[PDB]
Amino acid sequence: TRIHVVQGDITKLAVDVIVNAANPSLMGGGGVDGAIHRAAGPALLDACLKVRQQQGDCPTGHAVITLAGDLPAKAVVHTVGPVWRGGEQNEDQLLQDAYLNSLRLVAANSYTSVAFPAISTGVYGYPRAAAAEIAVKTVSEFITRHALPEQVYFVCYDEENAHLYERLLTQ
Numbered sequence: 001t002r003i004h005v006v007q008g009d010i011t012k013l014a015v016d017v018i019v020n021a022a023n024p025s026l027m028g029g030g031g032v033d034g035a036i037h038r039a040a041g042p043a044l045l046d047a048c049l050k051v052r053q054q055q056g057d058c059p060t061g062h063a064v065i066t067l068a069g070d071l072p073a074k075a076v077v078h079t080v081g082p083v084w085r086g087g088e089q090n091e092d093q094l095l096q097d098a099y100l101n102s103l104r105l106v107a108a109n110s111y112t113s114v115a116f117p118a119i120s121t122g123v124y125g126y127p128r129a130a131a132a133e134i135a136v137k138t139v140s141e142f143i144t145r146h147a148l149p150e151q152v153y154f155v156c157y158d159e160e161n162a163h164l165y166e167r168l169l170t171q
């Protein structure tokens, strides 16, 4: 009842917090990162540069929160998923960290809902089934233990990722 699968563009979803699958520079990129920067407008990049002055780059697994610009969200949490290098560089733990640290920022800032993209499964090349398992398990445990966020949306950009998530949530 608190976890939903949505098919579409994360930049259109009205939620308190949209999560960005960023890179450590925080200055944007070509996937959902680029889509979020484009939808938010230049204010987002300017906010990310301030964050760089405060705390430098965002290392793999870390998360930072900023304003959301023209997005229909109150804030954007930027996190950096691992690059898949075949499983022996601790990618599973780092992906879990990205989800957990993002959820912690949502809760610490008293936000009630959050939307996640499929972190690391695009250009970072994380096997989709394993990544979704990690997202679902991590989120599930967290909301079992915490009242915030109240609602979590797994935003899937294609039918097949939506199906993996829907199948995982019913197990």
Ligand SMILES: Nc1ncnc2c1ncn2[C@@H]1O[C@H](COP(=O)(O)OP(=O)(O)OC[C@H]2O[C@@H](O)[C@H](O)[C@@H]2O)[C@@H](O)[C@H]1O
Pocket (backbone or CB within 6 Å): 008, 009, 010, 011, 021, 022, 023, 028, 029, 030, 031, 032, 033, 034, 035, 081, 117, 118, 119, 120, 121, 122, 123, 124, 125, 155, 156, 157, 161
């Ligand atoms: N508008 C969108 N809404 C929701 N999901 C999207 C959208 N656009 C892309 N996606 C999906 O988000 C998932 C993550 O893919 P990427 O955006 O490639 O992110 P990731 O694999 O974590 O790679 C991060 C790298 O890509 C750059 O954009 C970013 O700066 C970083 O260097 C993929 O399933 C992708 O199809």
